[PDB]
């Protein structure tokens, strides 16, 4: 059944997004490939490879956010590409409130490619824009 | 072997990008799934599905010229996911010249997911950011 | 039957939006109530009533450029036998006669009511 | 009577707005469906679903300045026994620490459905000019 | 019988608004008092008196308009002050299109005081804001 | 010319009314302004609002809480009948901030008065500026 | 009587403003003292003396008028100073329409001092601003 | 004689300007008519009547003066209108220094109409601008 | 008070000099202004320039090539001696562009006159504005 | 003997400029006529008369300055008009530093008319521009 | 002798710069390696490989410049790296004049790496900034 | 073989970049020629020679911290010119976080020419652009 | 005589400036060294050498508006028999098609060397404030 | 001897520039003429004469931040036995006490004259 496999990718992507917002680099480093490639706003239009580029935010910005946030995932589409591969597409809304009573919402679009290596799904590439 | 698979994906992508810049929707529609999903600047942050969104450009803008353009593909990385699936990521430079001989270069980052369906490689999803 | 009703409202809505982009006021005036209420950017923050406010655009704008519309994440609330709500985002691709493309996005709520066995749009809310 | 039901929906909407402006989430969460859908400025052009998106503001800003709300030009569409839609403009008067007055205007559409004998708000659309 | 009087004030105002949009000064000058007082955006914050201030627009602006427009009257409230006096207030939406073809909507808020002088309803004072 | 006294009564009530506004005296204001008054004013954001609640909000949060001086210019009074009158005038408000810098604000005001039960009540007004 | 003299000063002023708008320098030069002083925006904060400074606009602007206008005199206040002197204070609204068809309104504040010299009323000083 | 009256109007004006700068409202209220009219920048293009509008600045600004100033009266011109009336026109330079120590100069143009009422000279109208 | 006539002569020459400037009459100007005149003026960019060449350039390229009116205000004349005088005044120049829009420009001028050979010559001047 | 008279006017002007920069009003008031006419940037385009206009700066600005400054006189030209009259013109550079420590240079152009009244040279008129 | 080799690199760089300013792609294509790498302002911060990226300007902008120009080469430093390799560094000033009488100067800094392949010096990499 | 030579250059460059970010001038001065030439943003478009220009940063800015930074090297291409010379070209991404937890990414493009002098590889020239 | 040589250099500089402003390259190229060095705004902060950089302007803009040049505060440093340096400010008056006047100021240093008995300008530095 | 003279002027010039960056007015006042003329940005387009104009900066600025100077493309015109001109660009690296570096560039001409057997700077021109 494929609908079961769509649910696992969604489950894993939720798990991955939770690890980013809570600064839990240990879960992140187990779900994302050590040779992950990516495009994202901080990569300044370059394809960057490796976890260290992202570990830098877990060390300095994600683990040190005092602000409360709420994340919403919109329109999750999962392409089951085979028995060992999948692609998930979704928009991500982050609500936040700063030192004042001033709230803001930010939107990102994300593509994440999951691959089954060993018997484990690992995110081998992602593209983020917003 | 792996290298040949990477070359096949790079060829398909080269031919896919060729059809776009040429305005050759006949080749585009054979390479891109009819239920393709995608993120691109013109989707305004939304995941749009289907070919009609892109066909709009083949019939009204990609048909148009005579501006000369040269396209350069940079740093293409191909993930071979399985026998039936692959992902390619690359940057795209477009050189152009407007009226009065002023040259500009534009850069796009692209993720294309490829899937073998019926023995044929089809682009089931892509993600573009400026 | 829950999904049948959803598809029926999505059909009517597609039909309505086509009538807007075509400039086909005959179809629009048959699907939209003569006493429709609405919020839209041109109403300038006011609730306006009646088709005339909208007929103005069919007569002086919409009947005059290629475009393509996309309806995103349509959700239909089935409200009973004779009522439904549909809400969606709408992307309008267009060109400026100079060869440049633009995409505009609007958010739409439309309330459908079955009056005399016919589905009519009695209220809609459009924002950007 | 149509007059009677129109008034019921207006009173449900006043009760709901009061719960929003006072930070009373228990009342809000009983009037708004757990799977509510909505468009509002903070949804950034998206259709968002569920209470959590709104509960975020009850927990982090709403339970905090004097204000007065006015409901302008309310129109209630009665849609059968168990459904109604109401649309109106909402004027919010407020004063900052500086004692400076300020009026904000929003336009709202709220779809109400009677579920389990209770009137629940299943979708709302909020915008500003 | 007050709802009778209200529908008459509304009809007169509609007739008045129509004479403005169409540039029919003959109908305007029969409905508006020759010594009408008014506040409006073109009066620059001043209470102006007399028709001559307004006739200036019928003879220059309100005539030369060939642009299509549609007028909507919103939230009309009529205060029936007595047998010989009434007051009406409303918002007025004006849609229009460019020669380029782009549309815009303008909003004004209008108060109009009507007095029965002789046997006719005359607009003796009006107030307009919003630009 | 028996009506010249009738225009002095309106002027006196209007001055009494504006006095109530600038001193924060809601009790006098509520006696002079109809409970179902309609109005346009800059703080209504272009909308016709009804009732005293909209205006009581300023008496409770801004007007009772800096030195000011108010001038009424070119007051014209229209006598419409035995039970109805209309007055229109411009209002200059001078003020000074904390820093000691002077400021003058101008508003145009139309006020409609109606005799109800032998008492002149302000049933509609329109303010711009 | 007091009100007749007010009416006279107002009449002279209306006559003077009419001469200004229609470019009629013959009437202006009979009503305005040859050694008139004045403050006006074109005097750049200076008190200017003589008719020549004003004749300049009659010969180059006021008579080259190619635009329709209407003038309104607001809240005229006359100070009857003596037998042979008066002062009038008023605001002047000028409505006009540009070449395209767009209307505008300008406001000026004016003080005019009138003196009866040789049995004839002459404007000996005026002060204009916006 | 003509020059003695000019000297008198100038003297009254200097006396009046001194009362303005030192916040001396007792002298101001004896020299300025209780029904004085005026145009000045704080009247927002309106002709305002009465002393109360001006008393406001004596009680809240002119008497709260905490800055040194010097006033110069430039090119005073007196029109002797009759026995009981005069008009004076002049420019007023006000030098001052801010809290830090930076000097500035402001210019105003003033017309003042004086009337002899009950044998005493009273300023019945004035027009100020910049 | 024999010197009051001496100040009228300076005034007459100055008016004659400014007349020569506005009419483009270099011949009169060159007779009234010293051949080794020194000056500050806005077109000298803050520098002291010497000689007539700098100013002849305007007579040849701008002043002889639009209607204008010139007003001289508050002319003060200083009589320094039998052979020397100084005059200072403000100058208002009104003009109108092609479009018909009016314009007024202000300049402050000091002019130093010296009797050389029984003839008053302008040996230094200073213009600002 | 004219070059003699020029060096004296230059010395007087240097004495005058020094009394300005140092805020010594006693020396200023002995060199500047009590009815001195002047044009300067603080006069806002007007010819002002009398010392009182300038004494205002000696008593507020030209005193309270503790900033270091250096003054340079450039291109001084002296017109010797006669025995009792002379004119001098020059550019004046003023350097100065902030409390922050940043330097700036300002330039003014100055004309000064000197008259021998009695047996003393008095500055009867001056013109300053450039700001 | 090395000073002779410095002169050949300078001679070749002059020859190369002449071919760019005159639009002579044929000389350019013989002096620059078909697998040349480069950084330059139009590469938008990317390393681009190949001649086609540059051929695009010869076809569209360099061969179609009507404007006259003068080139000046400042501070040419030549590093002789070996018998088959050299590096030359210099600043390049381009004077030009547009349709009007308006002249302008632009400055670029250039590094060019020359390699001896066969018996011919070819430019195998260049970096341009400005 | 070729690959080892490319690895040696990439190692030297890695060690060179390490010394810069660390502030370790002792290692920098051993890798960079004493007569090194260079173009960089801080040279304001000029070719500067010698180490003292760069030593200024080791003693006054690279010594400073405690801002965390991560550096990423992208697309390194190494030209092996001969036995005694090589050229490496790459892009450099620097992630950083200022006070208040705001992250920024900066990109630089770099050309470094390497020469074997006395059996030791020395960076004789480099070219940096932002 | 020092006065005599100072005058020679000033006249060489007037001749050179005249050749620049009239477009007379034959005269310029005989007064300016073929290996001249220079700083000027168009050199963009660089020391440029040779005539070609300047000949570019003779061929493409200079041979084209009335102008008057003034040399201000010339100072000549006599540096032995065969060398001198002169520094001065140059004011250029000009008029555009619109008949609008305009003054530009440059500061210049020119080093003159007697080579082959002829005075040649071997280096110049030009700036503007 | 042509190059010896060039190196002598480059030595003196380096020595002069060090005296500026050090705030060492004693050395500066020995290498620069008491009647030096100059153009520099602070002279505001004027030719100024004398050391006092420059002493102002030694007393209120230069004697108060780390910096490094670089002299670029120095060219010396040997003008005779007793005169030379040197022109060069000058880069001044500095920090703002907040940790940020800046580079400023100036273009300098300096005229050296041998008076009494000693080289003195009689004129200099500085622009940016």
The alpha-carbon gap from C117 to the nearest alpha carbon of chain D, in Å, equals: 13
Cα–Cα dist K59/K55, whole Å = 6
Answer yes or no: are the C-beta atoms of A108 and A74 closer than 8 Å: no
Report CB contact under 8 Å: C68, B52.
Answer: yes
The alpha-carbon gap from H87 to the nearest alpha carbon of chain I, in Å, equals: 19
Name chain I contacts of H93, Cβ cutoff 8 Å.
Answer: none
Triad A8, A9, A15: Cα angle to 5°: 90
Report CB contact under 8 Å: J127, I110.
Answer: yes
Name chain C contacts of D48, Cβ cutoff 8 Å.
Answer: none
Q: Chain M window 84-123: which residues touch N at a Cβ cutoff of 8 Å?
A: 85, 87-89, 105, 107, 109, 111, 113, 122-123
User: Considering only CA atoms, which of K14, M75, M45 is closest in space to residue N105?
Assistant: M45
Tell me whether the omega of the peptide bond preceding residue L66 falls within 30 degrees of 0, making it cis. yes
* C-alpha pair distances (Å), N89 with each of M51, N69, N107: 20, 10, 5
Chain F residue with minimum CA distance to E114: F80
Q: Which of K47, K115, K124 sits opposite L75 (nearest CB)?
A: K47
User: Considering only CA atoms, which of B85, L96, K16, F54 is closest in space to residue N99?
Assistant: L96
Name chain D contacts of E74, Cβ cutoff 8 Å.
Answer: 73
Report CB contact under 8 Å: B42, C93.
Answer: yes
Residue carrying the six token digits 């400036």: M17
* C-alpha pair distances (Å), A106 with each of A18, A96, A103: 17, 9, 10
The alpha-carbon gap from B13 to the nearest alpha carbon of chain K, in Å, equals: 19
Report CB contact under 8 Å: F86, E87.
Answer: yes
Cα–Cα dist H84/L122, whole Å = 101
Report CB contact under 8 Å: H43, F100.
Answer: no
For chain M, where are the alpha helices, taking DSSP H only?
2-22, 25-31, 52-57
Name chain N contacts of L47, Cβ cutoff 8 Å.
Answer: 72
Answer yes or no: are the C-beta atoms of H12 and H20 closer than 8 Å: no
Size of interface A-L (CB pairs under 8 A): 38
* Burial (Cβ within 10 Å: 0-12, 13-18, ≥19) of residue F5: exposed
Contacts of G66 (CB under 8 A, 6+ apart): none
The alpha-carbon gap from N97 to the nearest alpha carbon of chain L, in Å, equals: 10
Return the structure tokens found at H50.
């009465």
Tell me whether the omega of the peptide bond preceding residue K73 falls within 30 degrees of 0, making it cis. no
Contacts of L10 (CB under 8 A, 6+ apart): L76, L78, L88
Q: List chains touching A (3+ CB pairs under 8 A).
A: B, C, D, L
Distance, first Cα to last Cα, chain C: 33
Cα–Cα dist F62/D100, whole Å = 8
Antiparallel, parallel or unpaired: β K120-129 and L32-39: unpaired
Report CB contact under 8 Å: M91, I45.
Answer: yes
Return the structure tokens found at H18.
């001194």
Cα–Cα dist A116/J128, whole Å = 85
Answer yes or no: are the C-beta atoms of G90 and G110 closer than 8 Å: yes
Name chain N contacts of M87, Cβ cutoff 8 Å.
Answer: 37, 39, 47, 123, 125
Q: Give residues preceding each break in chain C, C–N over 2.5 A.
A: 64
Contacts of F4 (CB under 8 A, 6+ apart): none
Report CB contact under 8 Å: C47, D80.
Answer: no
Give, as one character, the DSSP assignment of residue N41: G
Chain E residue with minimum CA distance to G93: E43
Query: In CATH, what number is assigned to the domain containing residue F128?
Result: 3.10.450.50
Q: Which of H46, H55, H64 sits opposite F92 (nearest CB)?
A: H46
Report CB contact under 8 Å: N127, M127.
Answer: yes
Q: Which of A109, A124, A125 sits opposite B39 (nearest CB)?
A: A109
Chain C residue with minimum CA distance to A74: C73
Report CB contact under 8 Å: E125, F106.
Answer: no
Name chain J contacts of N59, Cβ cutoff 8 Å.
Answer: 68
Report CB contact under 8 Å: A61, L105.
Answer: no
SS (H, E, C) B83-129: CCEEEEEEEEEEEEECCCCCEEEEEEEEEEEEEEECCEEEEEEEEEE
Q: Which of C46, C57, C59 sits opposite E93 (nearest CB)?
A: C46
Per the structure, the count of domains in chain F is 1
Cα–Cα dist D106/D129, whole Å = 8
Return the structure tokens found at M124.
């110049």
Structural domain that includes position K18:
1-130
Name chain E contacts of D73, Cβ cutoff 8 Å.
Answer: 74-75
Helix (H/G/I), strand (E/B), else coil: K8: helix
Answer yes or no: are the C-beta atoms of L40 and L54 closer than 8 Å: no
Answer yes or no: are the C-beta atoms of A71 and B123 closer than 8 Å: no
Answer yes or no: are the C-beta atoms of C89 and D88 closer than 8 Å: no
Report CB contact under 8 Å: D93, F49.
Answer: no
- Expressed in Å, this structure's resolution amounts to 2.3
User: Considering only CA atoms, which of A110, A130, A129 is closest in space to residue A32?
Assistant: A110
Antiparallel, parallel or unpaired: β H120-129 and H32-39: parallel
Report CB contact under 8 Å: A60, L97.
Answer: yes
Q: Which of H48, H60, H61 sits opposite F92 (nearest CB)?
A: H48
**Phi, psi torsion values for A96, nearest 5 degrees:** -155, 170
Cα–Cα dist J34/J32, whole Å = 6
Helix (H/G/I), strand (E/B), else coil: K81: strand
Triad A23, A26, A27: Cα angle to 5°: 85
**Interface membership of I74 toward H (CB under 8 Å):** yes
Give, as one character, the DSSP assignment of residue C61: I
Name chain E contacts of G70, Cβ cutoff 8 Å.
Answer: 52-53, 56
Q: List chains touching G (3+ CB pairs under 8 A).
A: E, F, H, I
Q: DSSP E strands: which ranges in chain G?
A: 32-39, 48-49, 69-82, 85-97, 103-117, 120-129
Instruction: Tell me which of K71, K75, K76, K93 to substitute to probe the interface with M (most M C-beta atoms closer than 10 Å).
Output: K93
Q: Which of L47, L56, L64 sits opposite N93 (nearest CB)?
A: L56
DSSP H28-97: HHHHEEEEEEEE-GGGTT--EESSHHHHHHHHHTGGG--S-EEEEEEEEEEEEEETTEEEEEEEEEEEEE
Report CB contact under 8 Å: C80, D75.
Answer: no
The alpha-carbon gap from B89 to the nearest alpha carbon of chain L, in Å, equals: 14
How many C-beta neighbours within 10 Å does residue E57 have?
19
Return the structure tokens found at K23.
């639009």
Strand partners, M86: M76, M110
Q: Which of N45, N47, N79 sits opposite M75 (nearest CB)?
A: N47
Q: Chain J window 7-66: which residues touch N at a Cβ cutoff of 8 Å?
A: none
Cα–Cα dist G114/G121, whole Å = 6
Q: Does K have 3 or more CB contacts under 8 Å with L?
A: yes
The alpha-carbon gap from K72 to the nearest alpha carbon of chain B, in Å, equals: 23
Return the structure tokens found at C125.
């809310």
Instruction: Tell me which of H105, H106, H108, H109 to substitute to probe the interface with J (most J C-beta atoms closer than 10 Å).
Output: H105
Return the structure tokens found at L80.
């092996």
């Amino acid at each position: 059944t494929a609908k079961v496999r769509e649910q696992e990718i969604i489950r894993l992507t939720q798990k991955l997004i939770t690890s980013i917002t809570t600064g839990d680099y240990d879960t992140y480093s187990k779900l994302v490939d050590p040779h992950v490639t990516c495009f994202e706003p901080f990569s300044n239009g370059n394809l960057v490879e490796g976890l260290e580029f992202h570990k830098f935010y877990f060390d300095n910005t994600l683990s040190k956010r005092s602000v409360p946030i709420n994340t919403t995932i919109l329109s999750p589409h999962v392409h089951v590409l085979g028995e060992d591969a999948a692609c998930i597409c979704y928009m991500r809304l982050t609500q936040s409130v700063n030192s004042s009573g001033e709230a803001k919402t930010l939107q990102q679009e994300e593509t994440r490619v999951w691959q089954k290596k060993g018997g484990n799904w690992i995110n081998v590439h992602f593209h983020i824009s917003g």
